[PDB]
Design a protein around this ligand. Structure first.
Ligand SMILES: *[C@@H]1O[C@H](CO)[C@@H](O)[C@H](O)[C@H]1NC(C)=O
Ligand SMILES: *[C@@H]1O[C@H](CO)[C@@H](O)[C@H](O)[C@H]1NC(C)=O
Ligand SMILES: *[C@@H]1O[C@H](CO)[C@@H](O)[C@H](O)[C@H]1NC(C)=O
Ligand SMILES: *[C@@H]1O[C@H](CO)[C@@H](O)[C@H](O)[C@H]1NC(C)=O
Lengths: 411, 115, 96, 48, 49
């Protein structure tokens, strides 16, 4: 409903927590030509030694991919300089961070959300090897715990410089002033916001286990890697326009004059297969690098500080963000501010009093049908219009839609 | 009773029954893999450390250390943790530090601070 | 269908569906401002929305309220000019 | 009997088509409801 | 057979590269929609001049 003098201002809010999963790295792999293409045959080694120098390019590309994958996890979780630890007394002003904080009872210091995520998502004969990542699971968990402790205890200060302690209610008040709502709203409604936060955390904890499709990106990544490896292994056992797939049959059946042609054809086939594999791996590595850059930027602008960007760190007005480790990825818990109940009123651009036009100073004029008040845009907090809530500029005739009312003078 | 061979998901022979006696045995490829050399700057020193990727040390300096990434020869383990410069793999790093030798150790994330 | 086995699949979203989505976005940004993205749509007069944008860029609300007609005329002239320009130069659609 | 490339070809093409469908999905469907303008189009002197 | 397989492989490789470029462009367009149409942007030279 659109009208020239109608405005809808919320009277209540709901705290909502959303989850976003972003891939970070993919599995590191290496290929050995001699063990793969023929499998330690002297004739194949002699022929391929004189057949180009592709294997150097293959190995260099694979090593570069592995180095980039190591850098991907390095540039996302290691944005903190020190390993912050939470105080032993975990009060935090009525907020329950148990589901995100590490659990000392479990043998592995991993949060329940991380445990659920890791439970949901869990040398080949041809010379395929999978290299281990430089950063282990425990190291990424420690980095995530340090980031959580920093954002809980100090706020955004540990990203700009030295960590500065601040009570959590004061930090939430600062976030509220960041989104536009005044600090009073939080201080008067602390218990309700704490209860909403705890309920949202519990609900997302249940949801992460209820629907198994949330981990689709990481499942697709691991499935693609497995499919590529299995396709290569299966494609090795192919005729490729030869008498037999097994090199032993050719080398023991026929004389060298045509065995050379057969092994050359097999060499060409396996080289083409390896080239296709590494081309697809390079494309997938580029996509994963883009995803990792996005994840790092989201970490920087949502966990290390409040973001004014719309729909970037969640759906709504951003307050906080908590990171969680995941297999080959990171999970972001986005806390947002959403208006709940809308009530419409009558509004005017300005107020005419003693031939002086009064404009609202960080607010909007609101009328319930018999009196006019001033209140903030994102919350209904009526106030008596005085000379400190409004400022005077210009005359009364210029403004269109100006209404007449009396403004109180404190003095 | 009638089967003789065995074959895994990737169409590779896994287990074979010998035709003489009624016994079945697996077929696992004997250890292979790549090799790596860990060294500081050639001006800094000349000692080198050799890492065998993905092979147990039984299959393979007189110092032998079993890392999750593989077998490390020429470097000694230390009960410490430093900001590492040469990443070996699986949380293990090497460096040239003291009389001087290459030392393998677990990474240190950073100084522990409790606000 | 090309003789060599080349086929072009149709998109899931038709032209009319994308047009409806664009029209819905336009109606939301005209009637409610930025409120329909953060949460429930909240109606607000367009001059007040423009005043809020002016406070966002640094200029005070007075500037807009006193100069409403001039800004409206400038907006209409700019829309007409871009409408003419989109047809005058055919190189604007170069990416597509 | 000549390899199994066609499976990879078809899978890549299908993935590309799915991604292209997702591209238009993630740009224009950011709104939850289909808002409609009021019949009286004044809008404070602005010509939309 | 070899010639046509090579042609198809080249075609799909170029198609994959073009699809990656188009996906980057679509992500940029979605981000611009989010930060310019759904709300006012303080970023410089992002939603106009
Ligand atoms: C609020 O909106 C409803 C329709 O949505 C309308 O009937 C009512 O008159 C509005 N309130 C005022 C004070 O005009
Ligand atoms: C072959 O001879 C050995 C001799 O010990 C016997 O054990 C085995 O059963 C024979 N082969 C058969 C029929 O399994
Ligand atoms: C090795 O280090 C020394 C001292 O830092 C330096 O003088 C020398 O140039 C270095 N070697 C090379 C090859 O640069
Ligand atoms: C260093 O750690 C190993 C690993 O268990 C241990 O056996 C050894 O005793 C430690 N060194 C010292 C001096 O305690």
């Amino acid at each position: 409903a659109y009208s020239n003098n109608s405005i809808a201002i919320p009277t209540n809010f709901t705290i909502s927590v959303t989850t976003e999963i972003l891939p970070v790295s993919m599995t590191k792999t290496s290929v050995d030509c001699t063990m793969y293409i023929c499998g330690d045959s002297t004739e194949c080694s002699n022929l391929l030694l004189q057949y180009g120098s592709f294997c150097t390019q293959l190995k260099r590309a694979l090593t570069g991919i592995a180095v980039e994958q190591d850098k991907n996890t390095q540039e996302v979780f290691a944005q903190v300089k020190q390993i912050y630890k939470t105080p032993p007394i975990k009060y935090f002003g009525g907020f329950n961070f148990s589901q995100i904080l590490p659990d000392p009872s479990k043998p592995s210091k991993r949060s329940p959300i991380e445990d659920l995520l890791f439970n949901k998502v869990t040398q080949k004969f041809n010379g395929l090897t999978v290299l281990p990542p430089l950063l282990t699971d425990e190291m990424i968990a420690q980095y995530t715990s340090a980031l959580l402790a920093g954002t809980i205890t100090s706020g955004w200060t540990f990203g700009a410089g030295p960590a500065l302690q601040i009570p959590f209610p004061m930090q939430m008040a600062y976030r509220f002033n960041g989104i536009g709502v005044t600090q009073n709203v939080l201080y008067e409604n602390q218990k309700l916001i704490a209860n909403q936060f705890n309920s949202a955390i519990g609900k997302i904890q249940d949801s992460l286990s209820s629907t198994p499709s949330a981990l689709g990106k990481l499942q697709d990544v691991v499935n693609h890697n497995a499919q590529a490896l299995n396709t290569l292994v299966k494609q090795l056992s192919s005729k490729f326009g030869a008498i037999s797939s097994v090199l032993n049959d050719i080398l023991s059946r026929l004389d060298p004059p045509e065995a050379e042609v057969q092994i050359d054809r097999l060499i060409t086939g396996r080289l083409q297969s390896l080239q296709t594999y590494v081309t697809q791996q390079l494309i997938r590595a580029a996509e994963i690098r883009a995803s990792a850059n996005l994840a790092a930027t989201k970490m920087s602008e949502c966990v290390l500080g409040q973001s004014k960007r719309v729909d970037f760190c969640g759906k709504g007005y951003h307050l906080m963000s908590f990171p969680q480790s995941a297999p080959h990825g990171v999970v972001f818990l986005h806390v947002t501010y959403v208006p709940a109940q809308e009530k419409n009123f009558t509004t005017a651009p300005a107020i005419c009093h003693d031939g002086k036009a009064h404009f609202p100073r960080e607010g909007v004029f609101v009328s319930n049908g018999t009196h006019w008040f001033v209140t903030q845009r994102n919350f209904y907090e009526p106030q008596i219009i005085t000379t400190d809530n409004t400022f005077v500029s210009g005359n009364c005739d210029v403004v269109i839609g100006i209404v007449n009312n009396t403004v109180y003078d404190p003095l | 009773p009638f089967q003789q061979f065995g074959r895994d998901i990737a169409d590779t022979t896994d287990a074979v029954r010998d035709p003489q006696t009624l016994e079945i045995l697996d077929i696992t490829p004997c250890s292979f893999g790549g090799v790596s050399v860990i060294t500081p700057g050639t001006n800094t020193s000349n000692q080198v450390a050799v890492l065998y990727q993905g092979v147990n040390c039984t299959e393979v300096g007189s110092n032998v250390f079993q890392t999750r990434a593989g077998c490390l020869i020429g470097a000694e383990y230390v009960n410490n943790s430093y900001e590492c410069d040469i990443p070996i793999g699986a949380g293990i790093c090497a460096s040239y530090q003291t009389s001087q030798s290459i030392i393998a150790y677990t990474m240190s994330l950073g100084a522990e601070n409790s606000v």
